[PDB]
């Protein structure tokens, strides 16, 4: 049928324009969006598994791995001790990298208010409580 | 508070996504299609020939596992490439009749699916909320 458009197909396109601006907003920072994916969701959910970021990042969890082993070895994301154990603690945040989340969030919300822009501010607000409203 | 404290829009977007994927998918059970069988039909009824990639994409799969759908659509007739008449080259993936009717249907289930989703805001707010979705995109 010529006139069908699925809600799953509209979210999609409004990904499509959002996902080339939030990268082209994080480069200057030398971020890609799996990189702030991995970083801003480690910052509110230690060790969250790599599925599950790589579901969130639109990336297979092999990348997501990769993205994981450059986010440690770049001293932006540490496993800890855990005197108590054997194992590590829950993939955490260090001071490098929550600084650099911190900036990583203040520039994706630049770039999301830029893909807003096309909306009135109150047409904005309201749009974002639909989400919410929806999620 | 918790996790959509400050949420990105992306984040949001995937959570909306997050619900209405498993109702998609339940509605298209009865028919014998999953959810990027479906999504493979409707971009195929619209975008005659279209690469495996960019189906995985929308259909937020790989591309190996975009052509494994490829290969069911193809072997339940819904989808054909059939051979040139007269070169030797393959024609580009097309649905044939029962491919078309068996997207009929999905489309009305999965548009049903959509209305589920969309309960959770009062009927003016779809109408906004799918514009503003048609101008975002
Ligand atoms: O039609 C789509 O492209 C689609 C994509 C994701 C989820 C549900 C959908 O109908
Ligand atoms: O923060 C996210 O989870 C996200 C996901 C996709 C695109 C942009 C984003 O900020």
New binding site residues.
Partial sequence: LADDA????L??RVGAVLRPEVSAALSPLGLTLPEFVCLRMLSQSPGLSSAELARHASVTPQAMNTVLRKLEDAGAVARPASVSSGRSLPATLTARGRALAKRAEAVVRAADARVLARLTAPQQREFKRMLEKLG
Avoid at 6 to 9: A, E, S, V
């Fill in positions: 699925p809600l799953g197909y979210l999609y």
